[PDB]
Write a protein that holds these residues in place. Sequence first.
Motif, short mmCIF file in Angstrom:
data_model
loop_
_atom_site.label_atom_id
_atom_site.label_comp_id
_atom_site.label_asym_id
_atom_site.label_seq_id
_atom_site.Cartn_x
_atom_site.Cartn_y
_atom_site.Cartn_z
N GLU A 1 -4.28 6.16 -6.39
CA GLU A 1 -3.80 7.51 -6.11
C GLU A 1 -4.55 8.55 -6.93
OE1 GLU A 1 0.34 7.11 -6.92
OE2 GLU A 1 0.79 6.31 -4.93
N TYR A 2 -4.71 8.28 -8.22
CA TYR A 2 -5.37 9.26 -9.08
C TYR A 2 -6.87 9.32 -8.77
CZ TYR A 2 -6.71 11.89 -13.20
OH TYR A 2 -7.25 12.83 -14.04
N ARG A 3 -7.49 8.18 -8.47
CA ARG A 3 -8.89 8.19 -8.03
C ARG A 3 -9.03 9.06 -6.78
NH1 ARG A 3 -10.55 6.42 -3.23
NH2 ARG A 3 -9.57 4.36 -3.54
N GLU A 4 -8.09 8.93 -5.84
CA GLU A 4 -8.14 9.73 -4.62
C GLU A 4 -7.96 11.22 -4.91
OE1 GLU A 4 -5.04 7.94 -2.31
OE2 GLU A 4 -6.32 6.38 -1.46
N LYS A 5 -7.14 11.55 -5.90
CA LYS A 5 -6.94 12.95 -6.28
C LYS A 5 -8.24 13.56 -6.80
CE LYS A 5 -4.59 15.80 -9.77
NZ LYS A 5 -3.44 15.90 -10.72
N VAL A 6 -8.91 12.84 -7.69
CA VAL A 6 -10.18 13.31 -8.23
C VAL A 6 -11.22 13.38 -7.10
CG1 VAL A 6 -12.07 12.74 -9.82
CG2 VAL A 6 -9.67 12.45 -10.53
N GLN B 1 1.62 6.58 -16.64
CA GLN B 1 0.45 5.76 -16.32
C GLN B 1 -0.75 6.63 -15.98
OE1 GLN B 1 1.16 2.80 -13.31
NE2 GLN B 1 -0.98 2.13 -13.25
N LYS B 2 -0.54 7.64 -15.14
CA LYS B 2 -1.62 8.53 -14.75
C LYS B 2 -2.09 9.41 -15.91
CE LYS B 2 -0.49 8.49 -9.86
NZ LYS B 2 -0.03 9.27 -8.68
N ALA B 3 -1.19 9.79 -16.82
CA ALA B 3 -1.61 10.50 -18.03
C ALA B 3 -2.60 9.65 -18.84
CB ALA B 3 -0.41 10.88 -18.89
CL LIG Z 1 -2.24 11.44 -8.49
#
Ligand SMILES: [Cl-]
Lengths: 6, 7, 228, 227
Positions: free
Chosen positions: C81-86, D13-15
């Motif tokens: 999810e965070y990779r996709e956000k970036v 986790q994302k932090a």
């Molecule tokens: Cl995210």
Amino acid sequence: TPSLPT
Amino acid sequence: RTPSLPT
Amino acid sequence: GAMGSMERASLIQKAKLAEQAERYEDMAAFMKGAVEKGEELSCEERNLLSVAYKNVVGGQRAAWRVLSSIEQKSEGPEVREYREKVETELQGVCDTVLGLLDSHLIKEAGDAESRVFYLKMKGDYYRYLAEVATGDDKKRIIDSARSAYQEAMDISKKEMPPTNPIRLGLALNFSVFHYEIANSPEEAISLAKTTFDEAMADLHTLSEDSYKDSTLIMQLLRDNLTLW
Amino acid sequence: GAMGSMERASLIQKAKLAEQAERYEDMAAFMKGAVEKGEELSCEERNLLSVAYKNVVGGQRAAWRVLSSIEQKSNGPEVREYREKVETELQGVCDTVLGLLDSHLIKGDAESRVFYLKMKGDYYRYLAEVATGDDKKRIIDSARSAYQEAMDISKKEMPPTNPIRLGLALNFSVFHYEIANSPEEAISLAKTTFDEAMADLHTLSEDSYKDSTLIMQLLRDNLTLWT
Ligand SMILES: [Cl-]
Ligand SMILES: [Cl-]
């Protein structure tokens, strides 16, 4: 493979 | 200026 | 955009201030505003434009690679999810740059040097999109990058000497595209080799400073040939 | 807000991922979302919150100092305008942090109470750096009050080698020297803190000794700078 810097 | 806590 | 009410000269001034403050997102926003005034850019100005966005997209690419690395070593959905956000933010910046180039920097460029500079940028930013693209989208992006690079090649061969640093840097990045993106190692090697040889032929005619400029980029071509 | 539908554990986790990618603006937003779930932060989570906003406002402060220097050397409206833009963004982040502290975090245990009150002093101090009028006087008083309350708790409830206590003393002494025009108080505080910590090092493990002495070394560096 490196492209032109920077 | 004078350095503050860096952590 | 938010910069429409600011004078062009003020935007350029603030872009240079932002650079001094290492505020590259601000710098890019100011230069976008300057471009959207609709006037051609000087050599100094289009290099401000390029520096600003290269720094912004460079930071995003580096973050994307960190996250992609973590993701591939992966039991939850959070890394993806965070990779996709970036990824989405990176795609937004590339789309913004490509939009400036198409509307209307390339068509209004008044000389060969600037045309090649902008077309090379177009190839570069499609290449950055290709790095994170996947399916049919990736294939379309790859064709777009190749076409921009090839148009730049055609102009540079007709209008610039084979030792010209802009021409050399274009060939360097296009060859990287062939190898890293288009899975065309033969084209990558052929382009780097031909570029190297044709530059070498003229080195004896150059001033000391130009010889330095040209052999520097020839060595970048050489580093890649050795790697490939 | 935008983090409202995300699980607390996912935000944490994302932090941590954002820290690894050096994406501190993202990191701060994730930690703000986690604070807004309304549960108390663990020691590890407090550190995530702090390092995120430290890096965000650190970049803004450095930029503000560059632009301020250019502006004072010049003294069009452009340099002032851009310095003001950066200043306003910096103030916005400090207000965000102070709002989180007052609305959610400042309330039991000495470790958390002192940590958050020190943070409150720090972010009022960053506001004081860019303030000027009677406004600056009020902000300075707010920083002093937060630091002083943290000091009072730390001296009653923590040993003199406690790293939170030491870091608080370091920053409060910097406040005295750089903000409050009180170099004598700054020097006295750094010296007594260093000396009282030194006397109690014999109680510590190898790892705790290193934790404490690194901060003591910073106190010594400022003392040598100041004297
Ligand atoms: Cl995210
Ligand atoms: Cl501005």
